Design a protein around this ligand. Structure first.
Ligand SMILES: *[C@H](CF)CC(=O)C(=O)O
Length: 59
């Protein structure tokens, strides 16, 4: 399994490392998939690069 997670910029390294660990564990547990088979990619979005309803995250 390969997971990619788009999140807004601004979080600490430590919190991102938690995200990676906890998502990986959830995938492994859910699927009975070996933990070493699980890859996670965190993709940070600049606040001026994410829209909801046509309005920026930076607003
Ligand atoms: C997760 C993607 F299907 C499995 C994988 O990449 C692997 O078996 O190494």
């Amino acid at each position: 399994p390969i997971a990619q997670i788009h999140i807004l910029e601004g979080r600490s390294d430590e919190q991102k490392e938690t995200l990676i660990r906890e998502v990986s564990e959830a995938i492994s547990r859910s699927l009975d998939a070996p933990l070493t088979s699980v890859r996670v990619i965190i993709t940070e979005m600049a606040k001026g690069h994410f829209g909801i309803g046509g309005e920026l995250a930076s607003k």
